[PDB]
Enzyme design. Structure first.
Site, PDB file in Angstrom:
ATOM      1  N   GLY A 187       9.038   8.203  21.169  1.00 17.82           N
ATOM      2  CA  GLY A 187       8.908   9.282  20.223  1.00 17.82           C
ATOM      3  C   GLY A 187       7.827   9.054  19.192  1.00 17.82           C
ATOM      4  O   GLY A 187       7.990   9.442  18.027  1.00 17.82           O
ATOM      5  N   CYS A 244       9.930   0.299  -8.492  1.00 23.51           N
ATOM      6  CA  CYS A 244       9.454   0.532  -9.838  1.00 23.51           C
ATOM      7  C   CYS A 244       7.963   0.236  -9.971  1.00 23.51           C
ATOM      8  O   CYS A 244       7.499  -0.833  -9.589  1.00 23.51           O
ATOM      9  CB  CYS A 244      10.277  -0.311 -10.784  1.00 23.51           C
ATOM     10  SG  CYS A 244       9.763  -0.082 -12.521  1.00 23.51           S
ATOM     11  N   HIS A 262       7.707   1.288   7.211  1.00 25.08           N
ATOM     12  CA  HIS A 262       7.130   2.195   6.225  1.00 25.08           C
ATOM     13  C   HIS A 262       8.086   2.468   5.069  1.00 25.08           C
ATOM     14  O   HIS A 262       7.841   3.386   4.285  1.00 25.08           O
ATOM     15  CB  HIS A 262       6.685   3.513   6.865  1.00 25.08           C
ATOM     16  CG  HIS A 262       5.594   3.371   7.877  1.00 25.08           C
ATOM     17  ND1 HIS A 262       5.557   4.141   9.010  1.00 25.08           N
ATOM     18  CD2 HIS A 262       4.484   2.595   7.912  1.00 25.08           C
ATOM     19  CE1 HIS A 262       4.482   3.835   9.719  1.00 25.08           C
ATOM     20  NE2 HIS A 262       3.810   2.899   9.071  1.00 25.08           N
ATOM     21  N   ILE A 275      11.360   6.865   8.144  1.00 29.88           N
ATOM     22  CA  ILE A 275      11.875   6.535   6.820  1.00 29.88           C
ATOM     23  C   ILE A 275      13.222   7.206   6.539  1.00 29.88           C
ATOM     24  O   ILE A 275      13.722   7.149   5.418  1.00 29.88           O
ATOM     25  CB  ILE A 275      10.843   6.879   5.727  1.00 29.88           C
ATOM     26  CG1 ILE A 275      10.527   8.383   5.672  1.00 29.88           C
ATOM     27  CG2 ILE A 275       9.558   6.088   5.946  1.00 29.88           C
ATOM     28  CD1 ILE A 275       9.749   8.818   4.402  1.00 29.88           C
ATOM     29  N   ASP A 276      13.848   7.808   7.546  1.00 29.52           N
ATOM     30  CA  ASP A 276      15.046   8.627   7.346  1.00 29.52           C
ATOM     31  C   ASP A 276      16.365   7.890   7.576  1.00 29.52           C
ATOM     32  O   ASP A 276      17.434   8.472   7.330  1.00 29.52           O
ATOM     33  CB  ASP A 276      14.988   9.853   8.255  1.00 29.52           C
ATOM     34  CG  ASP A 276      14.658   9.503   9.652  1.00 29.52           C
ATOM     35  OD1 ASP A 276      15.485   8.834  10.276  1.00 29.52           O
ATOM     36  OD2 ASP A 276      13.538   9.857  10.106  1.00 29.52           O
TER      37      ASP A 276
HETATM   38  C1  LIG Z   1      -1.715  10.213  10.685  1.00 31.80           C
HETATM   39  C2  LIG Z   1      -2.637   9.471  10.806  1.00 31.80           C
HETATM   40  C3  LIG Z   1      -3.825   8.520  10.963  1.00 31.80           C
HETATM   41  N1  LIG Z   1      -4.101   7.767   9.721  1.00 31.80           N
HETATM   42  C4  LIG Z   1      -3.775   6.369   9.689  1.00 31.80           C
HETATM   43  O1  LIG Z   1      -3.281   5.781  10.598  1.00 31.80           O
HETATM   44  C5  LIG Z   1      -4.104   5.637   8.417  1.00 31.80           C
HETATM   45  N2  LIG Z   1      -3.132   4.589   8.263  1.00 31.80           N
HETATM   46  C6  LIG Z   1      -2.898   4.033   6.954  1.00 31.80           C
HETATM   47  O2  LIG Z   1      -3.500   4.467   6.001  1.00 31.80           O
HETATM   48  C7  LIG Z   1      -1.901   2.888   6.910  1.00 31.80           C
HETATM   49  C8  LIG Z   1      -0.638   3.277   6.186  1.00 31.80           C
HETATM   50  C9  LIG Z   1       0.079   4.400   6.958  1.00 31.80           C
HETATM   51  C10 LIG Z   1       1.438   4.692   6.292  1.00 31.80           C
HETATM   52  C11 LIG Z   1       2.137   5.816   7.075  1.00 31.80           C
HETATM   53  N3  LIG Z   1       3.396   6.108   6.389  1.00 31.80           N
HETATM   54  C12 LIG Z   1       4.395   6.852   7.059  1.00 31.80           C
HETATM   55  S1  LIG Z   1       4.158   7.504   8.506  1.00 31.80           S
HETATM   56  C13 LIG Z   1       5.725   6.907   6.321  1.00 31.80           C
HETATM   57  C14 LIG Z   1       6.169   8.341   6.096  1.00 31.80           C
HETATM   58  C15 LIG Z   1       5.152   9.072   5.212  1.00 31.80           C
HETATM   59  C16 LIG Z   1       5.857  10.377   4.913  1.00 31.80           C
HETATM   60  O3  LIG Z   1       6.229  11.095   5.892  1.00 31.80           O
HETATM   61  O4  LIG Z   1       6.114  10.642   3.709  1.00 31.80           O
HETATM   62  N4  LIG Z   1      -2.518   1.827   6.163  1.00 31.80           N
HETATM   63  C17 LIG Z   1      -3.523   1.049   6.841  1.00 31.80           C
HETATM   64  O5  LIG Z   1      -3.845   1.263   7.969  1.00 31.80           O
HETATM   65  C18 LIG Z   1      -4.211  -0.041   6.030  1.00 31.80           C
HETATM   66  C19 LIG Z   1      -4.678  -1.166   6.665  1.00 31.80           C
HETATM   67  C20 LIG Z   1      -5.334  -2.146   5.941  1.00 31.80           C
HETATM   68  C21 LIG Z   1      -5.474  -1.993   4.572  1.00 31.80           C
HETATM   69  C22 LIG Z   1      -6.168  -2.986   3.676  1.00 31.80           C
HETATM   70  C23 LIG Z   1      -6.677  -4.249   4.375  1.00 31.80           C
HETATM   71  F1  LIG Z   1      -7.256  -5.050   3.431  1.00 31.80           F
HETATM   72  F2  LIG Z   1      -5.646  -4.907   4.943  1.00 31.80           F
HETATM   73  F3  LIG Z   1      -7.567  -3.972   5.350  1.00 31.80           F
HETATM   74  N5  LIG Z   1      -6.995  -2.631   2.484  1.00 31.80           N
HETATM   75  N6  LIG Z   1      -5.884  -3.276   2.247  1.00 31.80           N
HETATM   76  C24 LIG Z   1      -4.995  -0.871   3.923  1.00 31.80           C
HETATM   77  C25 LIG Z   1      -4.362   0.117   4.664  1.00 31.80           C
HETATM   78  C26 LIG Z   1      -5.507   5.054   8.622  1.00 31.80           C
HETATM   79  C27 LIG Z   1      -6.603   5.830   8.287  1.00 31.80           C
HETATM   80  C28 LIG Z   1      -7.875   5.306   8.475  1.00 31.80           C
HETATM   81  C29 LIG Z   1      -8.030   4.017   8.977  1.00 31.80           C
HETATM   82  O6  LIG Z   1      -9.329   3.505   9.156  1.00 31.80           O
HETATM   83  C30 LIG Z   1      -6.930   3.238   9.301  1.00 31.80           C
HETATM   84  C31 LIG Z   1      -5.656   3.766   9.113  1.00 31.80           C
HETATM   85 ZN   LIG Z   2      11.336  -1.525 -13.467  1.00 34.60          ZN
END
Ligand SMILES: C#CCNC(=O)[C@@H](NC(=O)[C@H](CCCCNC(=S)CCCC(=O)O)NC(=O)c1ccc(C2(C(F)(F)F)N=N2)cc1)c1ccc(O)cc1
Ligand SMILES: [Zn+2]
Length: 267
Positions: free
Chosen positions: A214, A131, A123, A107-108
């Site tokens: 990476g 908003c 991401h 995200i950088d």
């Molecule tokens: C680290 C780590 C491991 N965690 C994961 O991978 C989890 N993933 C997650 O939670 C990911 C999002 C990950 C975002 C990561 N963001 C980053 S790295 C940006 C920078 C953040 C920062 O630095 O500030 N989301 C999902 O995997 C996800 C998938 C499906 C749904 C849904 C469906 F209907 F489609 F099934 N319900 N609507 C919702 C979320 C996860 C947890 C449990 C699961 O069963 C599946 C995924």
């Molecule tokens: Zn707004």
């Protein structure tokens, strides 16, 4: 998996459509704190504590302090030789009618800063807001993003919350809205944008070579992208400082910092 650079480069020489998936390691090699694994802590927390909708609901000031800190540190960060090799490859191959696309977990914006053009930031970005009232997404590079956050976000353990009232956190500037902004960053528990997934899938389904660079291949769904390509029969090369849970699905694994291995691989 193979560690033959020569065999990798034979595929590279002929590939018409290369997908490069990148993660936090590439950012860490520029000194960007990633708040995951060895990527650091902010105060007493890591990303998985703060990058959640519940954290933002309960303490939007603290979550904004965290992202404010991360925005402001970027002013001193530069793309590294890995970012540059990736951008140079895209430019060079593009003149030959060959496509290179970067699908980044990061995200950088350092791939953008390096000159990557075909870029999917799956991401979101430190430098976009969304908003919470009207849903508008906007670029935002303001330093500080709002006056109340000036000098805030300090990362040392024991730093007290700024406890900025929500009215003084970043607010929507669309005429007639004024809602509370959040970072336009995909948080844990949130799904990725379906339009971004469609764009990802279009590249994965047509590429003829994939690099996964990476990334620890533990953040889903992104961690499944390169395995999906490999399962289609397409060669996947992992460039990472260590093996991962996904390594044995791939055709190649090259151990080391991406800034060391990618300039040779993508020459
Ligand atoms: C680290 C780590 C491991 N965690 C994961 O991978 C989890 N993933 C997650 O939670 C990911 C999002 C990950 C975002 C990561 N963001 C980053 S790295 C940006 C920078 C953040 C920062 O630095 O500030 N989301 C999902 O995997 C996800 C998938 C499906 C749904 C849904 C469906 F209907 F489609 F099934 N319900 N609507 C919702 C979320 C996860 C947890 C449990 C699961 O069963 C599946 C995924
Ligand atoms: Zn707004």
């Amino acid at each position: 998996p193979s560690s033959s650079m020569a065999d990798f480069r034979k595929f590279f020489a002929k590939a018409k459509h290369i997908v490069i998936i990148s993660g936090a390691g590439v950012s860490a090699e520029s000194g960007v704190p990633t708040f995951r694994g060895a990527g650091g802590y902010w105060r007493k927390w890591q990303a998985q504590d703060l990058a959640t909708p519940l954290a933002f609901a309960h303490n939007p000031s603290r979550v904004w302090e965290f992202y404010h800190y991360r925005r402001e540190v970027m002013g001193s960060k530069e793309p590294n030789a890995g970012h540059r090799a990736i951008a140079e490859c895209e430019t060079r191959l593009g003149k030959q009618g060959r496509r290179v696309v970067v699908i980044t977990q990061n995200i950088d914006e350092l791939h953008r800063k390096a000159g990557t053009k075909n870029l999917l930031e799956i991401h979101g970005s430190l430098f976009k807001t969304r908003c919470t009232s009207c849903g508008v997404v906007a670029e935002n590079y303001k330093s500080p993003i709002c006056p109340a956050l000036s000098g805030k976000g300090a990362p040392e353990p024991g730093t007290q919350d700024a406890s900025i009232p929500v009215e003084k956190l970043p607010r929507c500037e669309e005429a007639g809205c004024g809602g509370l902004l959040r970072p336009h960053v995909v948080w844990f528990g949130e799904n990725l944008d379906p339009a971004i997934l469609e764009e990802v899938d279009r590249e994965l389904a047509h590429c003829d070579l994939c690099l996964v660079v990476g990334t620890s291949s533990v953040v889903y769904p992104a961690a499944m992208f390169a395995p999906q390509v490999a399962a289609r029969g397409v060669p996947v090369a992992e460039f990472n400082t260590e093996t991962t849970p996904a390594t044995n699905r791939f055709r190649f694994h090259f151990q080391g910092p991406c800034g060391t291995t990618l300039p040779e691989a993508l020459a």
